[PDB]
Amino acid sequence: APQTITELCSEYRNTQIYTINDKILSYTESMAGKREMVIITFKSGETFQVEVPGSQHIDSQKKAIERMKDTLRITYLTETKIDKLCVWNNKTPNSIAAISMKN
Amino acid sequence: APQTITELCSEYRNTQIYTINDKILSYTESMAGKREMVIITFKSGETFQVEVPGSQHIDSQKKAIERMKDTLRITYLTETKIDKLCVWNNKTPNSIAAISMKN
Amino acid sequence: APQTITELCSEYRNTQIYTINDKILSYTESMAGKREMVIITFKSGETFQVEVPGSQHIDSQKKAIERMKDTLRITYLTETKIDKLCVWNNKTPNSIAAISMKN
Amino acid sequence: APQTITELCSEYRNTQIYTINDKILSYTESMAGKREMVIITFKSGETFQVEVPGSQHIDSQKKAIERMKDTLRITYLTETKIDKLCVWNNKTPNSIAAISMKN
Amino acid sequence: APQTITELCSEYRNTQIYTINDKILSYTESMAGKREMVIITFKSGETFQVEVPGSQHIDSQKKAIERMKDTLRITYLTETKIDKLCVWNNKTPNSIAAISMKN
Numbered sequence: 366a367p368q369t370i371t372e373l374c375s376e377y378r379n380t381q382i383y384t385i386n387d388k389i390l391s392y393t394e395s396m397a398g399k400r401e402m403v404i405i406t407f408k409s410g411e412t413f414q415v416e417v418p419g420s421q422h423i424d425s426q427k428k429a430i431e432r433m434k435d436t437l438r439i440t441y442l443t444e445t446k447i448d449k450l451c452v453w454n455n456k457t458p459n460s461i462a463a464i465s466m467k468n
Numbered sequence: 469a470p471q472t473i474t475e476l477c478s479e480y481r482n483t484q485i486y487t488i489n490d491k492i493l494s495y496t497e498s499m500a501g502k503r504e505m506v507i508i509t510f511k512s513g514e515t516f517q518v519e520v521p522g523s524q525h526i527d528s529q530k531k532a533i534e535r536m537k538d539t540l541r542i543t544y545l546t547e548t549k550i551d552k553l554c555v556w557n558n559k560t561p562n563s564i565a566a567i568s569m570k571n
Numbered sequence: 572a573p574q575t576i577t578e579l580c581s582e583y584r585n586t587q588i589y590t591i592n593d594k595i596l597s598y599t600e601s602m603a604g605k606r607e608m609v610i611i612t613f614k615s616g617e618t619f620q621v622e623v624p625g626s627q628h629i630d631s632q633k634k635a636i637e638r639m640k641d642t643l644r645i646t647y648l649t650e651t652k653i654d655k656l657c658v659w660n661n662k663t664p665n666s667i668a669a670i671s672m673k674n
Numbered sequence: 675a676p677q678t679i680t681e682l683c684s685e686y687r688n689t690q691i692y693t694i695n696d697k698i699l700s701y702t703e704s705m706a707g708k709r710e711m712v713i714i715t716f717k718s719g720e721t722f723q724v725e726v727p728g729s730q731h732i733d734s735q736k737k738a739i740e741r742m743k744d745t746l747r748i749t750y751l752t753e754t755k756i757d758k759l760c761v762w763n764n765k766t767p768n769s770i771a772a773i774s775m776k777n
Numbered sequence: 778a779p780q781t782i783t784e785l786c787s788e789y790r791n792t793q794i795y796t797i798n799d800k801i802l803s804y805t806e807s808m809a810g811k812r813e814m815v816i817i818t819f820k821s822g823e824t825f826q827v828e829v830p831g832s833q834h835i836d837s838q839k840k841a842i843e844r845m846k847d848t849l850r851i852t853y854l855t856e857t858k859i860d861k862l863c864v865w866n867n868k869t870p871n872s873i874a875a876i877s878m879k880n
């Protein structure tokens with residue numbers, strides 16, 4: 366198994382590592398029909414999404430998708446600094462695949 | 469996908485943005501039969517609900533309605549200030565579709 | 572839908588509002604068969620329960636009961652003041668139907 | 675329904691009330707197969723468990739057990755004082771049936 | 778049942794105890810297909826994972842795995858000291874079987 370996020374990220378196509386080194390600036394969450402997602406932004410101006418669960422996801426990614434949204438909400442509320450994000454760049458906003466934080 | 473709550477809100481009929489910029493003043497939660505809902509208020513007098521899950525909701529919203537109430541409760545308890553609410557105004561009190569927070 | 576817990580509570584029979592305006596003095600949780608419940612008490616001597624899920628409850632009340640026990644646990648832990656309780660008074664200890672909290 | 679942890683504890687066979695009135699010293703959590711359990715210890719010497727789910731539990735006890743582990747984790751992390759524990763003494767280490775915490 | 782994590786660890790083959798006595802240095806989480814896992818590292822250089830659920834895991838272990846990720850994120854967030862880790866050493870990074878924390 367991978368041992369860092371850089372590594373996990375280079376196993377997939379259309380992705381990229383973003384070095385954040387910052388807390389989340391805004392948290393957006395929606396429960397509207399077909400728009401059940403989370404958007405975050407940074408002071409740098411970047412915007413990321415956790416995508417609405419869809420046909421592109423495998424079954425084992427569904428619980429992971431709710432956990433990610435859980436993680437982002439709590440990271441926002443505690444002002445925890447995020448280290449890196451591994452994101453899919455064929456979407457807009459770019460879509461979160463993985464996250465890392467370090468103390 | 470949408471990049472902000474406002475853009476997401478304007479994909480729906482019967483919605484409107486309230487710019488709150490404030491901590492929730494009060495939190496109500498009910499488990500009584502047919503009234504399984506949350507009600508929040510602001511220092512302004514604005515009252516909002518998370519509707520009781522129903523016929524108007526599609527399957528993918530069911531987890532999202534539950535996430536939304538988890539969000540409103542921890543927001544209330546931490547005194548986190550809400551930025552904007554995207555709400556349906558064909559309900560009374562108005563019904564939340566999406567919420568955003570900024571630090 | 573109702574806009575306050577008092578209005579909400581008044582839609583049911585065998586219910587009354589308790590105005591607490593105080594933090595929970597003790598929290599009790601049980602996983603014992605047939606007594607899967609939470610009990611809370613106040614410095615006033617008042618005692619209240621979240622009842623065991625039973626044939627009195629309908630379908631949609633199942634997650635709400637779990638949410639209400641989660642809420643009482645975090646309210647206890649953060650020493651958050653409860654404003655009112657809407658309870659069913661045909662049970663002892665009286666049974667929580669709804670909770671509000673003001674900040 | 676019972677009104678305190680002691681009345682509730684008296685309804686079962688093989689139980690006993692421990693009045694610890696102290697935080698949890700250590701928290702151990704396992705996901706190893708057939709040992710999916712929580713163990714806690716206190717300064718005064720005792721060691722208690724949350725049993726691995728099994729046929730001795732009825733169906734409404736499955737969610738209760740998960741809740742109980744949730745509670746012991748947060749209680750540990752916050753140093754919340756546990757007042758009493760209703761435990762079954764026909765297991766080793768003794769097994770949690772109920773806990774109480776007080777202000 | 779085992780009374781400590783070292784007694785529980787030694788019931789399993791291909792396991793060993795890591796005495797960390799330290800707070801988690803980095804927390805990594807991924808929702809990418811087939812890498813639905815969590816990775817933690819320590820100031821000492823040590824690196825550990827929560828494997829992706831698979832056929833080596835029995836159903837009772839599926840909930841325990843979600844529980845273990847939940848525990849690592851909140852442990853990370855609150856800077857809590859991890860006392861010991863019981864890990865499977867036939868995997869890289871080594872895989873968490875059990876965790877323990879004290880004061």
Ligand SMILES: O=C(NCCCN1CCOCC1)c1cc(O[C@H]2O[C@H](CO)[C@H](O)[C@H](O)[C@H]2O)cc([N+](=O)[O-])c1
Pocket residue numbers: 376377378379416421422423426453454455456460808809810811812
């Ligand atoms: O490039 C991909 N996989 C390539 C193999 C990587 N590898 C898989 C086996 O174990 C080790 C890691 C790969 C790309 C994927 O990509 C797609 O779905 C994503 C959401 O997951 C995003 O929506 C992304 O925009 C989209 O293009 C999806 C999956 N998937 O959800 O199964 C795999």
Ligand SMILES: O=C(NCCCN1CCOCC1)c1cc(O[C@H]2O[C@H](CO)[C@H](O)[C@H](O)[C@H]2O)cc([N+](=O)[O-])c1
Pocket residue numbers: 397398399400479480481482519524525526529556558559563
């Ligand atoms: O305005 C709607 N359609 C607008 C399309 C926006 N959407 C973006 C993604 O691509 C699909 C279309 C729209 C209105 C809806 O409306 C209704 O349900 C809401 C709760 O869901 C509220 O209760 C609202 O008061 C009620 O009128 C419901 C849905 N729905 O639950 O599926 C869509």
Ligand SMILES: O=C(NCCCN1CCOCC1)c1cc(O[C@H]2O[C@H](CO)[C@H](O)[C@H](O)[C@H]2O)cc([N+](=O)[O-])c1
Pocket residue numbers: 500501502503582583585622627628629632659661662666
């Ligand atoms: O909560 C109930 N919901 C079922 C229908 C609810 N309905 C829609 C919303 O506004 C008013 C009434 C409901 C609760 C009722 O109350 C009963 O169940 C409760 C738990 O739900 C309590 O245990 C209470 O002690 C018990 O007497 C009785 C009836 N009944 O006789 O129909 C309905």
Ligand SMILES: O=C(NCCCN1CCOCC1)c1cc(O[C@H]2O[C@H](CO)[C@H](O)[C@H](O)[C@H]2O)cc([N+](=O)[O-])c1
Pocket residue numbers: 603604605606685686688725730731732735762764765769
């Ligand atoms: O928890 C039990 N609840 C089921 C019945 C509850 N009872 C119904 C009426 O209101 C008062 C309490 C119950 C527990 C019992 O105890 C058994 O299971 C427990 C876990 O739940 C512990 O593992 C304990 O060590 C074990 O002996 C034994 C019986 N029994 O031998 O019949 C019932």
Ligand SMILES: O=C(NCCCN1CCOCC1)c1cc(O[C@H]2O[C@H](CO)[C@H](O)[C@H](O)[C@H]2O)cc([N+](=O)[O-])c1
Pocket residue numbers: 705706707708790791828833834835838865866867868872
């Ligand atoms: O080999 C295993 N069990 C077999 C023991 C059966 N038993 C042997 C002697 O006594 C009488 C009968 C066995 C191997 C295990 O290990 C396997 O799965 C683990 C996760 O569960 C890890 O992924 C690990 O790396 C992998 O080897 C784990 C378990 N487990 O978590 O239950 C059991």
